[PDB]
Tab-separated table of C-alpha atoms and ligand atoms in Angstrom:
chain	number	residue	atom	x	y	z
P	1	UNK	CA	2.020	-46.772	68.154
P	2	UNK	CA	0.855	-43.690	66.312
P	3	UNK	CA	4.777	-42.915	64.506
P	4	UNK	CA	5.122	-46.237	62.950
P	5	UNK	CA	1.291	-46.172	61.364
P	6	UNK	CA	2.192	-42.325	60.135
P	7	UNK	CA	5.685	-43.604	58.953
P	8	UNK	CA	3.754	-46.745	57.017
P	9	UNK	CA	1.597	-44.598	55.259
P	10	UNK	CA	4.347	-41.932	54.664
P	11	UNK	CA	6.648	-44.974	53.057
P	12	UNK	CA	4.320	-46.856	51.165
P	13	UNK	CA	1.637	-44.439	50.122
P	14	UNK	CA	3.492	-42.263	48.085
P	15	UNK	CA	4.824	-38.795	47.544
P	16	UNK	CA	2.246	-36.214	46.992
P	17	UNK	CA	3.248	-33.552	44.402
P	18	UNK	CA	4.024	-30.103	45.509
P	19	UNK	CA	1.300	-28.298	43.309
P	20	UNK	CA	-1.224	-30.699	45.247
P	21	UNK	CA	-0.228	-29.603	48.047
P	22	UNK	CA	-1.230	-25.786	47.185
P	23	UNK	CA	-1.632	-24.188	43.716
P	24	UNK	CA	0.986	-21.398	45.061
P	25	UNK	CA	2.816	-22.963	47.520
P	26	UNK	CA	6.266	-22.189	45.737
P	27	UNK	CA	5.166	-18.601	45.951
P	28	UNK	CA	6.265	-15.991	48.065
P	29	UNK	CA	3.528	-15.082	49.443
P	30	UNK	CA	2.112	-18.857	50.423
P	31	UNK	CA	1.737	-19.406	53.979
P	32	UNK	CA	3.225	-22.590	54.962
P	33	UNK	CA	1.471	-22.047	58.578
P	34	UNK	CA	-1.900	-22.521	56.727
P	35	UNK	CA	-1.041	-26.413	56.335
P	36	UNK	CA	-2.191	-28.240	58.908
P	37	UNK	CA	0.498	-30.160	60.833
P	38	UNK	CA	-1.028	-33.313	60.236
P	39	UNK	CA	0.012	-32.662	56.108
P	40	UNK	CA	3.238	-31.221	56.605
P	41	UNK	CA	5.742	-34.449	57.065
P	42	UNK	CA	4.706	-35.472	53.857
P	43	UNK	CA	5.075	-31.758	52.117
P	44	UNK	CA	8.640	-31.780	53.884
P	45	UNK	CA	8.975	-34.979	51.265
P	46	UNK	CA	7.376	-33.601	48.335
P	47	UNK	CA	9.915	-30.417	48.750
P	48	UNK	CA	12.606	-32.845	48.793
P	49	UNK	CA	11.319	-34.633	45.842
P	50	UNK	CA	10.655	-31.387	43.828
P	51	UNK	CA	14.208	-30.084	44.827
P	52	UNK	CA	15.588	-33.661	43.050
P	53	UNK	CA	17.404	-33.983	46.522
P	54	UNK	CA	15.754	-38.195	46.856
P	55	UNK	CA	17.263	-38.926	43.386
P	56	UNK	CA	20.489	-36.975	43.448
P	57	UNK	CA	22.004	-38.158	46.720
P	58	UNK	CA	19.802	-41.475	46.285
P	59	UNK	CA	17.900	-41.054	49.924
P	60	UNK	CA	16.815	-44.301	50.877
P	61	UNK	CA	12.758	-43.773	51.300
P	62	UNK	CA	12.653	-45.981	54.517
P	63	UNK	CA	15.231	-44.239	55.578
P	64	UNK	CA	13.905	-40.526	54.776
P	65	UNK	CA	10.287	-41.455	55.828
P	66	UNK	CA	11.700	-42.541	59.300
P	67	UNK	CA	14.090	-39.410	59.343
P	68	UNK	CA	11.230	-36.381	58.557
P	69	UNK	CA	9.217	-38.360	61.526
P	70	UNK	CA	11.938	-38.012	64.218
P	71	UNK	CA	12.806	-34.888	63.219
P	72	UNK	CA	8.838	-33.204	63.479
P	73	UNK	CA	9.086	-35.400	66.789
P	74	UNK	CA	12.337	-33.735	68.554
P	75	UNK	CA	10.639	-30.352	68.671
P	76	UNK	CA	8.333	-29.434	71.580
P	77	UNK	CA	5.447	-27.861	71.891
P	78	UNK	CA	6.290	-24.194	73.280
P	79	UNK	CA	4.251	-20.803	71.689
P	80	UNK	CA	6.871	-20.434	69.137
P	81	UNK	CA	9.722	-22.972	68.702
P	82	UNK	CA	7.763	-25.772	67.859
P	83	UNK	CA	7.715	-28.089	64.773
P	84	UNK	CA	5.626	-25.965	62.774
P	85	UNK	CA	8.041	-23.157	62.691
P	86	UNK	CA	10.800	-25.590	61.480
P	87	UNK	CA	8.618	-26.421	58.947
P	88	UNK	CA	7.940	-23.008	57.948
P	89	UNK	CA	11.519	-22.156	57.661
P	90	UNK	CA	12.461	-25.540	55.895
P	91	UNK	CA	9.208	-24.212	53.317
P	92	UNK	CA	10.900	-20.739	53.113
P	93	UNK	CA	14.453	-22.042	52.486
P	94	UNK	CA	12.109	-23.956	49.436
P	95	UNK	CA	11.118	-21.197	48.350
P	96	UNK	CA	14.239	-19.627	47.596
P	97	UNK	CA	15.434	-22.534	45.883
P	98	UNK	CA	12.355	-22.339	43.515
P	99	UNK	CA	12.551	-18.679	43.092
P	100	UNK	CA	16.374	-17.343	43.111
P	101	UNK	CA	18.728	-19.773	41.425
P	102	UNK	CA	20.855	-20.941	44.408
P	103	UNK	CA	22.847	-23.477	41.927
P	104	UNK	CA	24.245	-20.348	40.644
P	105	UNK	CA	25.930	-19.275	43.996
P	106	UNK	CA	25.992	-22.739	46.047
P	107	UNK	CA	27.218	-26.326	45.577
P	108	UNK	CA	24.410	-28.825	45.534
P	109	UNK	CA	25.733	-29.839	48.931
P	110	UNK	CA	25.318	-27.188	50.560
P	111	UNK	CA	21.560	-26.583	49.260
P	112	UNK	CA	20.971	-29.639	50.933
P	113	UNK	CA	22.598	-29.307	53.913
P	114	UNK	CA	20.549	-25.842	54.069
P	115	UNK	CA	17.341	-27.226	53.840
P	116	UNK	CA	18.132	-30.248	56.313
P	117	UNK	CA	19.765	-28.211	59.117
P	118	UNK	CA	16.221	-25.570	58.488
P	119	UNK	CA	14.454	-28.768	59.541
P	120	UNK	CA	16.920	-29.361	62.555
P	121	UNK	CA	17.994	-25.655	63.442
P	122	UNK	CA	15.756	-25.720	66.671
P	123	UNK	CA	15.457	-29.155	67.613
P	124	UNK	CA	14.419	-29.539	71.470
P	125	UNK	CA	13.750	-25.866	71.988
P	126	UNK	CA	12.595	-25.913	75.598
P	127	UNK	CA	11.087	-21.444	75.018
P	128	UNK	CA	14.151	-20.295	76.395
P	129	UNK	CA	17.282	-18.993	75.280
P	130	UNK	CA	20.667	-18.739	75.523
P	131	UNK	CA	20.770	-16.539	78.660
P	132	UNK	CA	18.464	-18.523	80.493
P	133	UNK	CA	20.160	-21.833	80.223
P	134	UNK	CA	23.255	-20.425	82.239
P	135	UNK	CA	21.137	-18.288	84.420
P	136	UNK	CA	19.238	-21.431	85.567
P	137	UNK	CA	22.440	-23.264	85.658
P	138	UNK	CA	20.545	-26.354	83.002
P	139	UNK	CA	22.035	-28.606	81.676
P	140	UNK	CA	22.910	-27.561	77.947
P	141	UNK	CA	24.999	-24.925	79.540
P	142	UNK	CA	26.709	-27.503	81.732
P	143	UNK	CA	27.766	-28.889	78.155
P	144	UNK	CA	28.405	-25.926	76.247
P	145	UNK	CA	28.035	-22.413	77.901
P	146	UNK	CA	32.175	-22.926	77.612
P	147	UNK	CA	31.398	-22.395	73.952
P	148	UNK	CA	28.749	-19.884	73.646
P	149	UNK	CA	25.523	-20.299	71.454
P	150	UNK	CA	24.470	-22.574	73.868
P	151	UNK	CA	20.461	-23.955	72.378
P	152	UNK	CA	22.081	-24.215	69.264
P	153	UNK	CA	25.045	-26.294	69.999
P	154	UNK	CA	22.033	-28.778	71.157
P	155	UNK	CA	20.120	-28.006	68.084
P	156	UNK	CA	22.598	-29.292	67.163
P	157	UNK	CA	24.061	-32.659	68.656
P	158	UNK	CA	19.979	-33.536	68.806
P	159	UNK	CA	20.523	-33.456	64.853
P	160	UNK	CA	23.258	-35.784	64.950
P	161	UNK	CA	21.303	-38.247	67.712
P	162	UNK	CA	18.659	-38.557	65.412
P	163	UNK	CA	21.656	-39.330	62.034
P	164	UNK	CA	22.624	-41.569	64.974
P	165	UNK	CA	19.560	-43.445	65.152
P	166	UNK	CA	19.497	-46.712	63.673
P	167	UNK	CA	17.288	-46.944	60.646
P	168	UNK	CA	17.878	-42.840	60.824
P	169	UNK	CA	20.669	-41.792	58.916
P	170	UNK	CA	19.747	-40.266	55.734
P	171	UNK	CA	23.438	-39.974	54.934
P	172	UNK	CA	25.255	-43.329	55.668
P	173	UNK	CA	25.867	-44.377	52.303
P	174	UNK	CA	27.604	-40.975	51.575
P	175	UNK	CA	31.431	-41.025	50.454
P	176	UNK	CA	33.246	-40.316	53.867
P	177	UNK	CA	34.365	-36.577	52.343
P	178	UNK	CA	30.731	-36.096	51.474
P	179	UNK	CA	29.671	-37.437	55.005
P	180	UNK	CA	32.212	-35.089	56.956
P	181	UNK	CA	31.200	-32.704	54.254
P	182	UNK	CA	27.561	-32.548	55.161
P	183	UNK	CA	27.972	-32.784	59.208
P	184	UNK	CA	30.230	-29.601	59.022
P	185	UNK	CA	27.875	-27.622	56.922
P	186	UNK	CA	25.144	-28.548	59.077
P	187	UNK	CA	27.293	-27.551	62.059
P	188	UNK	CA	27.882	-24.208	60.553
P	189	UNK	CA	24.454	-23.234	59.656
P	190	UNK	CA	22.755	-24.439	62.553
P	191	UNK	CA	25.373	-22.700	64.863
P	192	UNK	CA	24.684	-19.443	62.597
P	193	UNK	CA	20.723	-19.260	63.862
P	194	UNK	CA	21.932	-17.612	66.458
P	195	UNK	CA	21.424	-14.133	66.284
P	196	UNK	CA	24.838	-13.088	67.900
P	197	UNK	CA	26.256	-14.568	65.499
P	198	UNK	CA	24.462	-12.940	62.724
P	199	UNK	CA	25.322	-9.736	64.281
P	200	UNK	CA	29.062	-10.808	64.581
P	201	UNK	CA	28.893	-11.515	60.902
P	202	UNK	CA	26.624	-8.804	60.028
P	203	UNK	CA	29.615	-6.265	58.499
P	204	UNK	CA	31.144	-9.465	56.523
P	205	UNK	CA	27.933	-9.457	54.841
P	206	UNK	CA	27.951	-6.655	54.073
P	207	UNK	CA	31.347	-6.958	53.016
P	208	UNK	CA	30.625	-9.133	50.694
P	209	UNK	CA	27.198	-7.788	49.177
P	210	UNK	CA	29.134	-4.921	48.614
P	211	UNK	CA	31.826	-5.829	46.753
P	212	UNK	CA	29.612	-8.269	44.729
P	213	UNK	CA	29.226	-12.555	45.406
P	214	UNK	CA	32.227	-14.512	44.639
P	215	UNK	CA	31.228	-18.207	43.759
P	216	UNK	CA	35.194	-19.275	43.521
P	217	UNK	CA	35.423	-17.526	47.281
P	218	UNK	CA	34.564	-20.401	50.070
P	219	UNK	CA	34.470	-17.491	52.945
P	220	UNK	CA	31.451	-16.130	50.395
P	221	UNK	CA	29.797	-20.005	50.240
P	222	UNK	CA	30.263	-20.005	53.355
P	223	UNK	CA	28.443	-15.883	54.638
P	224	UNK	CA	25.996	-17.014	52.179
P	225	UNK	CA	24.373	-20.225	54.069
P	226	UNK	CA	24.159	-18.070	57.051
P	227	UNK	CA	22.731	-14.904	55.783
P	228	UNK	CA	20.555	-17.507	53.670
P	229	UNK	CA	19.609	-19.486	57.482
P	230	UNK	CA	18.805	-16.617	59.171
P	231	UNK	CA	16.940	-15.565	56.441
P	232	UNK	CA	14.705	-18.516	56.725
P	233	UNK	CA	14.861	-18.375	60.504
P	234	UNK	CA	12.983	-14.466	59.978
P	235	UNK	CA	10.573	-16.114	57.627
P	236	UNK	CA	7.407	-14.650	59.214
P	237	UNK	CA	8.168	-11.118	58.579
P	238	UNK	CA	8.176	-11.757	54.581
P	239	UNK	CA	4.348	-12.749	54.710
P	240	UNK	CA	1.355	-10.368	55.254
P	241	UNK	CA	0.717	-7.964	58.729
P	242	UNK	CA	-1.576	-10.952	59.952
P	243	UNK	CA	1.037	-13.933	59.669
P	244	UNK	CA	3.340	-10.860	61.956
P	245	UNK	CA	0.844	-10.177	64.364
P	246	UNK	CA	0.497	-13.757	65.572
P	247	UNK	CA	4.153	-15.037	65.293
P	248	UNK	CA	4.963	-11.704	67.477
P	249	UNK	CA	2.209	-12.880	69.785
P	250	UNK	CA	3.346	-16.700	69.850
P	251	UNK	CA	7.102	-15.274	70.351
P	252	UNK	CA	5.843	-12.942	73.652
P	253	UNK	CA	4.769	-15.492	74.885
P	254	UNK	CA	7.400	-17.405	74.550
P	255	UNK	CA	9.447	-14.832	76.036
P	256	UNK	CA	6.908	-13.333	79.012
P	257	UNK	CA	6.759	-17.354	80.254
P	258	UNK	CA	10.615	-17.217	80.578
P	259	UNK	CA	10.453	-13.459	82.468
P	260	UNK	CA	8.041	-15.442	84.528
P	261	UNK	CA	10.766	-18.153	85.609
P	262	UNK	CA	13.920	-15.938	86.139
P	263	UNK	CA	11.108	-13.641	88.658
P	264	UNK	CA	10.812	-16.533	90.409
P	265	UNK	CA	14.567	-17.455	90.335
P	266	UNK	CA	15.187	-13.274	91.770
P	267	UNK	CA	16.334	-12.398	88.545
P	268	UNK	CA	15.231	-9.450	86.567
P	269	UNK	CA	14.344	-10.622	82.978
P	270	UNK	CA	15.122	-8.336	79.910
P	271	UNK	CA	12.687	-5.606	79.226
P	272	UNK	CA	11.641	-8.020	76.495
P	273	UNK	CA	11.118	-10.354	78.631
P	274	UNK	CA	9.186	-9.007	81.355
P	275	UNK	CA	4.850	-8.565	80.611
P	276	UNK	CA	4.933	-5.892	83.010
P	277	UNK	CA	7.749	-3.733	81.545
P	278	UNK	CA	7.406	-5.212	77.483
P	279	UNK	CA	6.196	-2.509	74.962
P	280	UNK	CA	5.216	-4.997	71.797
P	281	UNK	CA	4.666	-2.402	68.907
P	282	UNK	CA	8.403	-0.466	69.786
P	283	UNK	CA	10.273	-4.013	70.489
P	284	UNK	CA	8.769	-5.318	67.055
P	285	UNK	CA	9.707	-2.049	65.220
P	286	UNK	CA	13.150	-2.598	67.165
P	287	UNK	CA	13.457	-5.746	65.701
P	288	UNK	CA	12.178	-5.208	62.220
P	289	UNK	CA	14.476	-2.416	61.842
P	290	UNK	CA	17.643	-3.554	63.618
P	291	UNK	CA	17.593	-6.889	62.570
P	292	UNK	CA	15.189	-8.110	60.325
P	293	UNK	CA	14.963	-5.548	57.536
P	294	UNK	CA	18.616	-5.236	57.122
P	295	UNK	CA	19.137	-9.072	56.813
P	296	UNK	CA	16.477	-8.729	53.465
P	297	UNK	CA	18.264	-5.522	52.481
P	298	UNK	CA	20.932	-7.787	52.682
P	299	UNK	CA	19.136	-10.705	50.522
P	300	UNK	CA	17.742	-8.343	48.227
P	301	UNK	CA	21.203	-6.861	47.344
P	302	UNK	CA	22.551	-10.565	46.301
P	303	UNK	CA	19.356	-11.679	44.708
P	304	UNK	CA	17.657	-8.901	42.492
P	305	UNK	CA	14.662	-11.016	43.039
P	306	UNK	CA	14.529	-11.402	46.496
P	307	UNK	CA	13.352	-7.391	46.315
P	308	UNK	CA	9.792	-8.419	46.897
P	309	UNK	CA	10.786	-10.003	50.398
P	310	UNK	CA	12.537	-6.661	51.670
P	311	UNK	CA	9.634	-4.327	50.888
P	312	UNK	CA	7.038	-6.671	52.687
P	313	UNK	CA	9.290	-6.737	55.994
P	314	UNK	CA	9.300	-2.896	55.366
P	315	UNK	CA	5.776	-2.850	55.031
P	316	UNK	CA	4.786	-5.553	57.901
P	317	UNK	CA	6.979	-2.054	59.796
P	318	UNK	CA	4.911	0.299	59.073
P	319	UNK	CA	2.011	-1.531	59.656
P	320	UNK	CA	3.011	-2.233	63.597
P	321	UNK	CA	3.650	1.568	63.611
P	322	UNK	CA	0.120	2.312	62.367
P	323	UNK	CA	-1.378	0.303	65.306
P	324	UNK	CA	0.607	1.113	67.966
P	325	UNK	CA	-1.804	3.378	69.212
P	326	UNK	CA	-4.049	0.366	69.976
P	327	UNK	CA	-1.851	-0.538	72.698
P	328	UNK	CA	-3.104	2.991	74.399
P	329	UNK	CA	-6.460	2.455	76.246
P	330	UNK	CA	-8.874	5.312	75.072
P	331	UNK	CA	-12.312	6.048	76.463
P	332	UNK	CA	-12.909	3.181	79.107
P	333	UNK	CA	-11.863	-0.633	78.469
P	334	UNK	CA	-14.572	-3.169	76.951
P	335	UNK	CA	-15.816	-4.007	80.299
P	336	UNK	CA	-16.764	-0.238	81.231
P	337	UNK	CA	-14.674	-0.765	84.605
P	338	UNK	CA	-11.776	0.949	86.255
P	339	UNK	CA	-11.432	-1.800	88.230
P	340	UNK	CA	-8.259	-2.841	86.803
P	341	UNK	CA	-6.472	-0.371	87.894
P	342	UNK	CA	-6.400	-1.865	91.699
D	1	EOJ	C1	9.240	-11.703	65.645
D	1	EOJ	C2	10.538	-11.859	66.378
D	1	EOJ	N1	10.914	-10.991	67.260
D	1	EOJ	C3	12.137	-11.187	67.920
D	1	EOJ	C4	12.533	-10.250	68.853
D	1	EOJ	C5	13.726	-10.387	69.528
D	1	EOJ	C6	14.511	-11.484	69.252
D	1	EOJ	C7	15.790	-11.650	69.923
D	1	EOJ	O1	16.206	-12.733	70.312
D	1	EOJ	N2	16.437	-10.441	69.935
D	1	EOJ	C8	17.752	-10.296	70.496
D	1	EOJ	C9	18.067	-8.831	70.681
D	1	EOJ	C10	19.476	-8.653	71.194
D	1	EOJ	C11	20.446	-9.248	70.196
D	1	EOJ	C12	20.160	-10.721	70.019
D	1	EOJ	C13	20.272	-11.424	71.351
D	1	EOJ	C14	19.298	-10.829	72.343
D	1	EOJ	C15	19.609	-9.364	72.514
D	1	EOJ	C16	17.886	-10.987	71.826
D	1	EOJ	C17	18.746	-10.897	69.526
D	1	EOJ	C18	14.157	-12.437	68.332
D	1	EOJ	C19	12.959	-12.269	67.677
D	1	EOJ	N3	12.526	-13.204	66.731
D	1	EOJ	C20	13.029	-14.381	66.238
D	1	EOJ	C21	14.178	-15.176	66.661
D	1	EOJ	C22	15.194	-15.483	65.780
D	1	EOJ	C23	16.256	-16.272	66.170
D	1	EOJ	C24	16.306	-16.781	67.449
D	1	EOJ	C25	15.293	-16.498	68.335
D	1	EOJ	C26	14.240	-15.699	67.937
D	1	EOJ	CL1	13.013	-15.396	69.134
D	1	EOJ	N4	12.191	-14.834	65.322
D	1	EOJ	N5	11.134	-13.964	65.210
D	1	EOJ	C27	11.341	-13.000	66.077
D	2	MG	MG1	17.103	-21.138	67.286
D	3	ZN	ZN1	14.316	-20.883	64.475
């Protein structure tokens, strides 16, 4: 069995140190898609390590080991939601524990039940979304379409199946307040990755950037894990135009695959949705500029230092607008044939 002879090594070998891992990889602009897959349960420990997390809570190591490996092992394999973009938002939510001071805003708790729900946040992600699960009438919506935010209400519970798994549960020896504690923050943050909830939220942020970050104020603890989430969830568009240009192409076709199932179930897919109707540069720019740039405006306004992250996502915008004309087919295509166009 290939999981127990990855876990023995990852258990008995020992922790690697971070600056092994890369010389910058608590920098901004590291790429945490650049380690292979292969190294990255055992960087998800040595960011665990470095964040004192293993000592302060005392994580059993068996425990851990076994934990990181069913986590990397719940996610599938579609374009996009796959293990290595929980990883890279787990690496990003890192970051900003290395570079802006959470402890000065969050409990330690709550750090570490940010980090753990970025590893969880998209658990079983089948490449389709919320729509799609009651449109096809599956059965997460059977559970929870009641509720709303249906993929991550099985985010989720997949989460708690794993705590749930004996030899698993990374938390058992917690205080029962601390338990409770931590399974209701994780709730919370996972159930903020989804977007319509950020929007929701979106003027409470505000709200609250605006009038300045109240540690004493548990609505601002609690605005601040999901602006914080989400802005781990974005991750991508903080790197450089090339780390963009493939997530948006690992995303389309994510989302082109699902226009492809609800055509065949008579349905007509969101213009996003749909390779014959999709526009990529103006739904990117869309994107950047309704949702993703505003969330780092956002960051940027708590954390003076978090400026850098903003004016990259800016600049990743400009850069899709500089290529757009790509997307227009001058002169004749590579194959010096019309024939396409039957
Ligand atoms: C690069 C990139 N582009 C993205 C373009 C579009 C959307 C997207 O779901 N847009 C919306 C647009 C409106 C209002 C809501 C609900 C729906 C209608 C769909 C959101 C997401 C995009 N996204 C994400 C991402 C983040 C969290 C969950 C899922 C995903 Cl896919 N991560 N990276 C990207
Ligand atoms: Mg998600
Ligand atoms: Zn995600």
């Amino acid at each position: 069995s290939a999981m127990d002879d990855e876990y023995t090594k990852l258990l008995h070998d020992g922790i690697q140190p971070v600056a092994a891992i890369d010389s910058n990889f608590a920098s901004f602009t590291y790429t945490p898609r650049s380690l292979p897959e292969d190294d990255t349960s055992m960087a998800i420990l040595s960011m665990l390590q470095d964040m004192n997390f293993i000592n302060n809570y005392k994580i059993d190591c068996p425990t851990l080991a076994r934990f990181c490996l069913m986590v990397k092992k719940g996610y599938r394999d579609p374009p996009y939601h796959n293990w290595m973009h929980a990883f890279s938002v787990s690496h990003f939510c890192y970051l900003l524990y290395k570079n802006l001071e959470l402890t000065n805003y969050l409990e330690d708790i709550e750090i570490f039940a940010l980090f753990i729900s970025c590893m969880c946040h998209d658990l079983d992600h089948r490449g389709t979304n919320n729509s799609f699960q009651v449109a096809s009438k599956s059965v997460l919506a059977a559970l929870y379409s009641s509720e709303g935010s249906v993929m991550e209400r099985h985010h989720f519970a997949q989460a708690i199946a794993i705590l749930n798994t004996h030899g698993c549960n990374i938390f058992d020896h917690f205080s029962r307040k601390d338990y409770q504690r931590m399974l209701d923050l994780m709730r919370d943050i996972i159930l903020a990755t989804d977007l319509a909830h950020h929007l929701r939220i979106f003027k409470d942020l505000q709200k609250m950037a605006e009038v300045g970050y109240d540690r004493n104020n548990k609505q601002h603890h609690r605005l601040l894990l999901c602006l914080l989430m989400t802005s781990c969830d974005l991750s991508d568009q903080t790197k450089g135009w090339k780390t963009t240009r493939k997530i948006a192409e690992l995303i389309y076709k994510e989302f082109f695959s699902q226009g492809d199932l609800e055509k065949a179930m008579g349905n007509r897919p969101m213009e996003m949705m749909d390779r014959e109707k999709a526009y990529i540069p103006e739904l990117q720019i869309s994107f950047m500029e309704h949702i993703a740039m505003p969330i780092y405006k956002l960051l940027q306004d708590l954390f003076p230092k978090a400026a850098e992250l903003y004016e990259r996502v800016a600049s990743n915008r400009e850069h899709w607008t500089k290529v757009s004309h790509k997307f227009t087919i001058r002169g004749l295509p590579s194959n010096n044939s019309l024939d396409f166009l039957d």
